[PDB]
Design an enzyme around this catalytic site. Structure first.
Site, mmCIF file in Angstrom:
data_model
loop_
_atom_site.group_PDB
_atom_site.id
_atom_site.type_symbol
_atom_site.label_atom_id
_atom_site.label_comp_id
_atom_site.label_asym_id
_atom_site.label_seq_id
_atom_site.Cartn_x
_atom_site.Cartn_y
_atom_site.Cartn_z
ATOM 1 N N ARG A 75 -3.339 -20.552 -37.762
ATOM 2 C CA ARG A 75 -2.465 -20.264 -38.898
ATOM 3 C C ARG A 75 -2.960 -19.035 -39.637
ATOM 4 O O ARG A 75 -4.160 -18.848 -39.813
ATOM 5 C CB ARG A 75 -2.394 -21.449 -39.863
ATOM 6 C CG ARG A 75 -1.794 -22.698 -39.262
ATOM 7 C CD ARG A 75 -1.528 -23.744 -40.336
ATOM 8 N NE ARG A 75 -0.702 -24.820 -39.809
ATOM 9 C CZ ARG A 75 0.423 -25.256 -40.363
ATOM 10 N NH1 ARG A 75 0.869 -24.721 -41.490
ATOM 11 N NH2 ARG A 75 1.094 -26.246 -39.785
ATOM 12 N N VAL A 111 2.295 -19.759 -37.546
ATOM 13 C CA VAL A 111 1.608 -20.979 -37.122
ATOM 14 C C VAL A 111 1.842 -21.185 -35.631
ATOM 15 O O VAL A 111 2.959 -21.013 -35.144
ATOM 16 C CB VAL A 111 2.179 -22.207 -37.864
ATOM 17 C CG1 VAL A 111 1.564 -23.497 -37.352
ATOM 18 C CG2 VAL A 111 1.981 -22.062 -39.365
ATOM 19 N N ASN A 112 0.793 -21.558 -34.905
ATOM 20 C CA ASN A 112 0.937 -21.798 -33.469
ATOM 21 C C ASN A 112 -0.189 -22.657 -32.921
ATOM 22 O O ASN A 112 -1.352 -22.372 -33.185
ATOM 23 C CB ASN A 112 0.940 -20.470 -32.707
ATOM 24 C CG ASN A 112 1.358 -20.635 -31.256
ATOM 25 O OD1 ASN A 112 2.532 -20.879 -30.970
ATOM 26 N ND2 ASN A 112 0.406 -20.496 -30.334
ATOM 27 N N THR A 113 0.155 -23.686 -32.148
ATOM 28 C CA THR A 113 -0.840 -24.583 -31.574
ATOM 29 C C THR A 113 -1.016 -24.338 -30.062
ATOM 30 O O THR A 113 -0.033 -24.218 -29.326
ATOM 31 C CB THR A 113 -0.439 -26.050 -31.799
ATOM 32 O OG1 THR A 113 -0.249 -26.286 -33.203
ATOM 33 C CG2 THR A 113 -1.509 -26.996 -31.248
ATOM 34 N N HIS A 160 9.410 -27.262 -26.523
ATOM 35 C CA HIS A 160 8.984 -26.993 -27.895
ATOM 36 C C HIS A 160 7.776 -27.837 -28.238
ATOM 37 O O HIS A 160 7.648 -28.965 -27.757
ATOM 38 C CB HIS A 160 10.084 -27.331 -28.903
ATOM 39 C CG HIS A 160 11.316 -26.496 -28.777
ATOM 40 N ND1 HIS A 160 12.556 -27.045 -28.539
ATOM 41 C CD2 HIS A 160 11.507 -25.159 -28.881
ATOM 42 C CE1 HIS A 160 13.461 -26.082 -28.491
ATOM 43 N NE2 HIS A 160 12.851 -24.927 -28.691
ATOM 44 N N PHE A 161 6.901 -27.290 -29.075
ATOM 45 C CA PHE A 161 5.792 -28.049 -29.635
ATOM 46 C C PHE A 161 6.213 -28.517 -31.019
ATOM 47 O O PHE A 161 6.451 -27.690 -31.906
ATOM 48 C CB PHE A 161 4.527 -27.183 -29.735
ATOM 49 C CG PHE A 161 3.287 -27.967 -30.047
ATOM 50 C CD1 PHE A 161 2.913 -28.195 -31.363
ATOM 51 C CD2 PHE A 161 2.509 -28.495 -29.025
ATOM 52 C CE1 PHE A 161 1.785 -28.936 -31.662
ATOM 53 C CE2 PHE A 161 1.376 -29.228 -29.311
ATOM 54 C CZ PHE A 161 1.010 -29.447 -30.633
ATOM 55 N N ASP A 162 6.320 -29.830 -31.217
ATOM 56 C CA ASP A 162 6.842 -30.337 -32.491
ATOM 57 C C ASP A 162 5.761 -30.557 -33.558
ATOM 58 O O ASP A 162 5.938 -30.204 -34.733
ATOM 59 C CB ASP A 162 7.629 -31.635 -32.285
ATOM 60 C CG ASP A 162 8.600 -31.904 -33.417
ATOM 61 O OD1 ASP A 162 9.342 -30.967 -33.772
ATOM 62 O OD2 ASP A 162 8.618 -33.033 -33.962
ATOM 63 N N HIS A 203 1.937 -22.134 -25.914
ATOM 64 C CA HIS A 203 1.212 -23.365 -26.239
ATOM 65 C C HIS A 203 0.168 -23.873 -25.242
ATOM 66 O O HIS A 203 -0.519 -24.843 -25.535
ATOM 67 C CB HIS A 203 2.200 -24.487 -26.585
ATOM 68 C CG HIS A 203 3.098 -24.147 -27.733
ATOM 69 N ND1 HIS A 203 2.616 -23.921 -29.005
ATOM 70 C CD2 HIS A 203 4.439 -23.960 -27.797
ATOM 71 C CE1 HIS A 203 3.623 -23.621 -29.807
ATOM 72 N NE2 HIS A 203 4.740 -23.636 -29.099
ATOM 73 N N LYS A 238 10.998 -33.892 -35.493
ATOM 74 C CA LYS A 238 11.133 -33.694 -36.934
ATOM 75 C C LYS A 238 12.563 -33.329 -37.320
ATOM 76 O O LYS A 238 13.053 -33.742 -38.375
ATOM 77 C CB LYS A 238 10.134 -32.645 -37.438
ATOM 78 C CG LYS A 238 8.682 -33.121 -37.380
ATOM 79 C CD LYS A 238 7.777 -32.360 -38.341
ATOM 80 C CE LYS A 238 6.352 -32.936 -38.322
ATOM 81 N NZ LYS A 238 5.453 -32.226 -39.284
ATOM 82 N N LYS A 279 3.206 -14.269 -35.932
ATOM 83 C CA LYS A 279 3.712 -15.643 -35.894
ATOM 84 C C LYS A 279 2.838 -16.454 -36.852
ATOM 85 O O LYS A 279 1.610 -16.432 -36.744
ATOM 86 C CB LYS A 279 3.642 -16.222 -34.480
ATOM 87 C CG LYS A 279 4.292 -17.600 -34.327
ATOM 88 C CD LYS A 279 4.295 -18.036 -32.868
ATOM 89 C CE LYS A 279 5.235 -19.216 -32.622
ATOM 90 N NZ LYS A 279 4.572 -20.545 -32.777
HETATM 91 CL CL LIG Z 1 3.138 -24.694 -33.032
HETATM 92 CL CL LIG Z 2 6.374 -35.560 -42.815
#
Ligand SMILES: [Cl-]
Ligand SMILES: [Cl-]
Lengths: 124, 124
Positions: free
Chosen positions: A85, A43-45, A119-121, A12, A66, A41
């Site tokens: 993505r 999705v990843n930010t 973690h990236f939420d 991240h 979440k 993977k």
């Molecule tokens: Cl992510």
């Molecule tokens: Cl939501």
């Protein structure tokens, strides 16, 4: 085994650029950070701020994650981020990603001593 | 049993306002949309656009969902949204939420005939 904090850094953090400069950013970064090994993977930010600034989020606004855990924190300021993505054309081992650059608050889960992101939420 | 499409409408649509106008928006909306019944829903995003505009996202940009499914779509334009997340003071039955208003692309999972939103995945 990679530590949780180190995995967060690898997945991240991208402090070397102020922002995604092109549509190919994600293809390049997902490969180089080893996020396309046996599968793409989905999705990843990546966050384009200093590691210190991102670590500092762990003492900013406490918010729910979440998943309902309570160790998440929302950055007081917006940060430069890029969401990566997979596109419809993506097929391992030829992963393909859409690059979306934005300036948003980040939400991370924090753990440990030192108390750091693991973690990236989400972003807001 | 509530249909998936109807649950998405109830949980994620608020077309009646252009934007969250105050810090109390989330407390009010989480209660009125029945998201605090037996427990406080930890995180929930409301979208301030017409139902038609949000439904239209299902034929916009196909992108991966965080969980790896391929039925997600990212809105071409940013939309007005409000993220609601529980604060540290939140304790059922006295749920308490932070309200964060933003203008971001939405990502939804779509299903069915008609092909409509059934999950809110993320915003960018
Ligand atoms: Cl992510
Ligand atoms: Cl939501």
């Amino acid at each position: 085994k990679e530590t949780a904090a180190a995995k967060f850094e690898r997945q991240h953090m991208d402090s070397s650029t102020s922002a995604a400069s092109s549509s190919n950013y994600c293809n390049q970064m997902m490969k180089s950070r080893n996020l396309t090994k046996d599968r793409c993977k989905p999705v990843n930010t990546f966050v384009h701020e200093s590691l210190a600034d991102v670590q500092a989020v762990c003492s900013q606004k406490n918010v729910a994650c979440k998943n309902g855990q309570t160790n998440c924190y929302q950055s007081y300021s917006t940060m430069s981020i890029t969401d990566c993505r997979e596109t419809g054309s993506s097929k391992y081992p030829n992963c393909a990603y859409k690059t979306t650059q934005a300036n948003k608050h980040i939400i991370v889960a924090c753990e440990g001593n030192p108390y750091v992101p693991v973690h990236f939420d989400a972003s807001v």
